[PDB]
Amino acid sequence: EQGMCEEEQVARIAWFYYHDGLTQSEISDRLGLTRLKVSRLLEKGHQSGIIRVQINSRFEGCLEYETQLRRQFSLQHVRVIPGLADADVGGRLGIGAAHMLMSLLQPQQMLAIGFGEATMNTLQRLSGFISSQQIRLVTLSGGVGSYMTGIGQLNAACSVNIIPAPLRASSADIARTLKNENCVKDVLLAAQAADVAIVGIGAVSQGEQLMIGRKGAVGDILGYFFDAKGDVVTNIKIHNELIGLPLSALKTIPVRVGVAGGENKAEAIAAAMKGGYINALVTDQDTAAAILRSLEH
């Protein structure tokens, strides 16, 4: 500190390394800090999205796949990240999804957010941008503590508007009761009103899973299950136990992005955009191929 808070240190380290091409350790003494600390803060700038590296070409991602995907599914935006062997697909989908949202969010707009590894992961890589552009966050679903891995990153300064309830009530009546507490009601409407949504997609509660497969549920968004035609599965108990925005209402959000990938995900992702729940998608190559395969059929 000389006498700069962390953020400044990071923003500066960046400029010196990139815009001026200075040496890693030569930076060290110019801001009067240890060479190890320089090395750290350069990573933290990338991990938290202070540093944004844009690739400005039609070939950022797998162009061929992206374009077929827009065509077949009528997508407003699409990114297919270039494949890798054994990589943490969760973490890689992270960077991608963060970088796309950086291109989509206008200053002070509102981003609704789901739970789950990918979404939390994307939010981690978007903290720099979120505060830098005063993006306002709203939880799409209950849970409170499960969002903490993505919103624990931010400055006190950021508006994060949480639904004050757990993800799922223990019975359907309790869940209805909760949905009418002014507090929950308020954030629920807040969420619906957002500009852009970011959600994970689950593919398919030990006893319940078999019964879900039975009804030909293909995947889930925010906890709600849908078949391959994309329509939300009926007479599942969970759906009325969930506190949070129902899929019908998610649709209000002008641009809603799914970030999902993995070997089993293909048909759940596809069923997702047939249903209209997402109109933007971030995946990886192998999953893009898979989705297209599945369409030939």
Add this chain to the structure above:
Amino acid sequence: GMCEEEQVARIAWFYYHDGLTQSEISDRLGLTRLKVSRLLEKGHQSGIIRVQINSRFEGCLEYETQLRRQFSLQHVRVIPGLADADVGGRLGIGAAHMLMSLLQPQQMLAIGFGEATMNTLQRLSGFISSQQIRLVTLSGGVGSYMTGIGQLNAACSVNIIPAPLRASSADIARTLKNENCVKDVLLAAQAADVAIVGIGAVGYISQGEQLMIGRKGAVGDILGYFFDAKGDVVTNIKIHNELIGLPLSALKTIPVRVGVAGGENKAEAIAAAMKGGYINALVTDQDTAAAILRSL
């Protein structure tokens, strides 16, 4: 040929102004060290030797000493009042330094909502990460905690009650406390090693409810719970059954529990809060300490 008093005053001057040793004084006036020791004892013993301190902090120290005696507190900080006029913000720096004295590494901290408390949490952020401190909410509200749970040792756990502060009915409150998403946190909360709260005086309450709460004899609240000037928790208040949070009896079960409080108006309230034993540590400003002490 010198009076006792005249010899007391000579010794005073030499010891406290000329800073000489007793071996010096006893040697120089030809009196025994044994005598000198006794005569310094007598100068202090009564009347003569009086130590005054010149600074704004003297008043703080004083009110600190009285609060400590009068309310048998375990810990007190009186900060300078409106004279330095960042009283709110400086209040939070205080509490955060007091908490730093109290928390062992890996201990758990029960946490009230409110500005003073959110504020102090902010100042406290660095200690939390490095010392690996666990946090727990004392009440529902979730969003009103956000501004202070704001940063993270990736390793540091924060336990937030997933419910509103106040339910629209006692029954809805009761069925909510029974959700084990909520219950888990409630339980985790009273295992806390230290608690930190703010004190309110008499919006989740209507102007009407407050007027009535005033009528039933409430003087202040902690965690939304109102008590009278005797520090008894006020009875026949509906709000109490509608609250989702650790009850003031269960709060008292935490060994060290510190209050942060500011306003002139807050005096009656704070006084009552330590009569009821809801806090055994206080961080306040000099103006408020005065008011508190004048009300006795």
Add this chain to the structure above:
Amino acid sequence: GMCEEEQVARIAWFYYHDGLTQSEISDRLGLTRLKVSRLLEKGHQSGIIRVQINSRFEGCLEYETQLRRQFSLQHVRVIPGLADADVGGRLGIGAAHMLMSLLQPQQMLAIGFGEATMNTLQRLSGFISSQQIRLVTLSGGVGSYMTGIGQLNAACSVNIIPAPLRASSADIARTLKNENCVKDVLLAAQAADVAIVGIGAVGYISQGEQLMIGRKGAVGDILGYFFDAKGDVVTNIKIHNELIGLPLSALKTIPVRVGVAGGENKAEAIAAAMKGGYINALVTDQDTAAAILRSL
């Protein structure tokens, strides 16, 4: 079968998002490290790979870089402007950290009057004592320096000109500069290793004098001396002969000399002050940097 561009974009993603090594990429796409190096060179070389930074500080860095090129400064700090709204006070923290980078131990610091400058001196107090820094006033006034010369390494020397800033006549000024109580300090002042001043824009001046100084084409002043938009010192100003202090020509004789300046309105003034070379280092706020840069 991949285009050059398609191979540039793959490499970008792997290197900057997946953070892999070139030995990895070259190994995994079956292309030479030598090729990869060249293709990363080309991605940057033009268009494709662009590094953006997300923070308020980015703007500061930018304006810093431009001021540095456009005014060939030795040192620049642009601090965040009105967005953090303790702009005055935060301005002084800036300058004090810049000065800390510049002063060797036992060096001498020439000192201008004014809020910004007094303020920065305050922030700088600890460095002064420990590093044994010598101070000298650049001008008379005495009392207007008091608020910043406020503390002391018993060992630390402060050289104050024992005269008013401005004499009531050129003759009285001339005979005052000849008093060797005054002259001694004047001399000591230009031996200074670093100078720190504030910049004024267009009370020791009457409303009339200022209007006229505006008419003769003054844009700002340093140490009471006014200059035009070209940074030339304005001529045919009476005030200049009435001033007791180091003249702006003799000021320029100090190797490193830093300005601290704030207001929106101050843009024209500051610009002119570095065109005249009266400062070769600047500490300003982002709002002002913008205004300065827009005036070119």
Add this chain to the structure above:
Amino acid sequence: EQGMCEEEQVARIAWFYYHDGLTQSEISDRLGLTRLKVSRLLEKGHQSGIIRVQINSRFEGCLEYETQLRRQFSLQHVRVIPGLADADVGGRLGIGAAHMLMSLLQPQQMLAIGFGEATMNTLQRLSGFISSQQIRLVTLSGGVGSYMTGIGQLNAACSVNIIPAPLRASSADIARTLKNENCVKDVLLAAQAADVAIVGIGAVSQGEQLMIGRKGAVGDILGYFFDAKGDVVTNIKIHNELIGLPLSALKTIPVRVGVAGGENKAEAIAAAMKGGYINALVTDQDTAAAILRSLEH
């Protein structure tokens, strides 16, 4: 720092050592500081007059001498500090004079000050009180830099109103010119208007000293010389070269204290209060005796 500025540390160290009688090193850990630092700050509290030790008896000083002195010279206040062998009389007069002024100054009153070892010394021992009670300082004389050893102690927060001129101009006309610069004029009136003055007294410029002795100057206050009858010596050149408040005007200040002591000082001190320039005096025993001796004659 935990997290207390120096001043607080001092005020606290004091209370713990005196009002609670705690151990020197036991204090150390209670405020989390090194035992050497504890030892330092306890001295700094005494040296700068944060810590004031009052002795509340008629025998604080040499009572016998004090009372004779009030009687013979019509003094409003008098302190005669108990004698010591080979002690720095300058430094000892310091403590005394500081302690007396602490008893005389009402909150926010104005103290005019002369130059010289004793006065500067007294101001050093009064810094705690000065800021603690918002005492306003004004220089009685020019000099500017010669007051720096007493006013360098204070907080930025204290009003110190300096005469912006040197102590003595090089010619009498220059000195007159200066006395009419609005700036000097302003502080000059400020000085006259004070509540309490504190000044040193000089007893008797190699070539000039013999000529001063010649005219039967006995001592000096603020640079002005007076004979044994107390009247200001006439036709000395210095008197018209001095920038600062003349002795006639010093008299305006309701209570003005001299702090002077030393073997040669006796008759200069006496001539001082015969002239009316001081109406309060701080000395030491040996000088009090001497003054009284001189009156028998």
